[PDB]
């Protein structure tokens, strides 16, 4: 048995029901479980991953020991993409994780 754990942020927590049903979400947990790297990394975010599952797009981050942090969830076109400044910030933040896990 390979066990995996999914930690929902409060944002993802409150907005999950409005988009993804329990079944679709269970399927999502399975799919992401078998392939942790399934979501492709956002350029310049240093390890932030994003996946589109059709209720479309999800931002998540992969930790050590098969732990997944589910950050936020929304539709295909909803909010504007992160500009390079924001990307630099996100990566800089992520380096605390990369440094702490080392």
């Amino acid at each position: 048995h390979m066990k995996s754990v999914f930690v929902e942020s409060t944002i993802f927590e409150k907005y999950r029901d409005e988009y993804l049903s329990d079944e679709e979400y269970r399927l999502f947990q399975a799919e992401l479980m078998l392939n942790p790297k399934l979501g492709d990394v956002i350029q310049g975010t240093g390890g932030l991953r994003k996946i589109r599952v059709a209720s479309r797009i999800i931002y998540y981050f992969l930790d050590e020991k098969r732990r997944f942090y589910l950050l936020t969830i929304y539709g295909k076109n909803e909010m504007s993409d992160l500009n390079a400044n924001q990307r630099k910030q996100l990566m800089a933040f992520m380096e605390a994780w990369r440094n702490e896990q080392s």
Binding site: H1, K3, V5, S9, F12, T72, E78, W97
Partner: protein
Amino acid sequence: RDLFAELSSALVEAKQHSEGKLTLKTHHVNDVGELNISPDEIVSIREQFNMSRGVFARLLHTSSRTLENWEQGRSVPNGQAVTLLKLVQRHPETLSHIAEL
């Protein structure tokens, strides 16, 4: 509803959760793992439907001799075989579904 604000908030929440200073909603999920079945459980499954090795093996899409090899412990059934057997075991009605297939 801005994206960067939510990402930042979620990420500092995540940092604090890793630190252990915060509780978040979390799901523990485990795999299907592997299945295994004893020969005596197999013969018990066949005996509970009161059918011969021939008929049973027909439903399992296999030869009677193969089924015998399983039941006598002379052989180990493949993955889909064990799956199917377990399925029939826990859900007997399945055996009828397979019949009418």
